[PDB]
Design a protein around this ligand. Structure first.
Ligand SMILES: NC[C@H]1O[C@H](O[C@H]2[C@H](O)[C@@H](O[C@H]3O[C@H](CO)[C@@H](O)[C@H](N)[C@H]3O)[C@H](N)C[C@@H]2N)[C@H](N)C[C@@H]1O
Ligand SMILES: [Cl-]
Length: 298
């Protein structure tokens, strides 16, 4: 977990962009992978906090260059790039700022119905076009096969928790994985390009027009199940809930809604294990401790 000063930020940019004068700078945001700085109040510069987050950022830059004029909404436009080292695949990236605020569930629910419905329509169109992008050209590395992922997660959890769980608890963990892996519905899909972190904090909104004006944070994008981009919005607490996503599904012409509901339900059940595994890979020990404690009360 690297941190940066404004000076280190400026120096790093100046080396590669000497003719770009920096007038203003301040932290605009911070995620699990990068800190973001607002330079000149007209450009968002992401710096990785660790190597994994830099690989994320490298992925983001590379996907955005392939899809930059293929979508019905604005997306982050890469303007500045950093360099690789032995530690980071990309030392930083600078993007054009997209004005707007996140379309939070609270904001969405306070909109006139007609504007809510237009938001579901515009999200559907964006997903339908995104999931229809021809991926024949793309890197095969981007393919995230869900059956391989779940099998690998089972092995990681065994590896992580072998000495933390009593034998009968570990058997029950093994049962859970074995059960998930015998259900074909989770692993039979037609892979396409997916945003893969398609949640409300990555949907920007223009409160003057009451319309969606951007989709951001493509660092998790990959070629996997397109249903991923609906289930990320179905959570009642931090996301839009079932009523609204069912509007999105209807505009998208989804043919198998009860499968999306089944995938959401399993994902919800899977969260304790995602916290254990993501906790360790992204070095968040509280995520890891909380999931481990959920499992001991399974
Ligand atoms: N905070 C508690 C919630 O955390 C997760 O969702 C949240 C995800 O954690 C958020 O995603 C973030 O965390 C995930 C890992 O969970 C990373 O893969 C992703 N790059 C990062 O942006 C995502 N963008 C929003 C979503 N509601 C759980 N899926 C649901 C849980 O209620
Ligand atoms: Cl319509």
């Amino acid at each position: 977990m690297r941190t940066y000063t404004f000076d280190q930020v400026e120096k790093a940019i100046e080396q590669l962009y000497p003719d770009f004068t920096i007038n203003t700078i301040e932290i605009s945001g911070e995620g699990n992978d990068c800190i973001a700085y607002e330079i000149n109040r007209d450009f968002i510069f992401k710096f990785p906090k660790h190597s994994r987050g830099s690989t994320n950022l490298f992925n983001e830059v590379n996907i955005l260059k392939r899809i930059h004029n293929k979508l019905p909404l604005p997306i982050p436009e890469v303007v500045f790039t950093g360099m690789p080292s032995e530690t980071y695949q990309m030392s930083f990236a600078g993007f054009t700022k997209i004005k707007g605020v996140p379309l939070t569930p609270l904001l969405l629910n306070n909109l006139p119905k007609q504007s809510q419905n237009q938001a579901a329509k515009d999200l559907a169109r964006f997903l339908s076009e995104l999931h229809s992008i021809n991926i024949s050209g793309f890197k095969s590395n981007l393919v995230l096969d869900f059956r391989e992922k779940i099998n690998e997660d089972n092995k990681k959890i065994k590896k992580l928790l072998s000495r933390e769980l009593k034998g009968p608890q570990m058997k029950k963990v093994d049962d859970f994985y074995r059960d998930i892996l015998e259900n074909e519905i989770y692993f039979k899909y037609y892979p396409c390009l997916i945003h893969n972190d398609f949640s409300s904090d990555h949907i920007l909104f223009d409160t003057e027009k009451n319309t969606i004006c951007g989709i951001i944070d493509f660092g998790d994008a990959a070629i996997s199940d397109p249903d991923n981009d609906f289930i990320s919005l179905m959570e009642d607490d931090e996301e839009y809930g079932m009523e609204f996503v069912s509007k999105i599904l209807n505009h998208y012409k989804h043919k198998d809604i009860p499968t999306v509901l089944e995938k959401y339900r399993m994902k919800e059940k899977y969260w304790s294990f995602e916290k254990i595994i993501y906790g360790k890979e992204y070095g968040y020990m509280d995520w890891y401790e909380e999931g481990l404690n959920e499992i001991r009360s399974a």
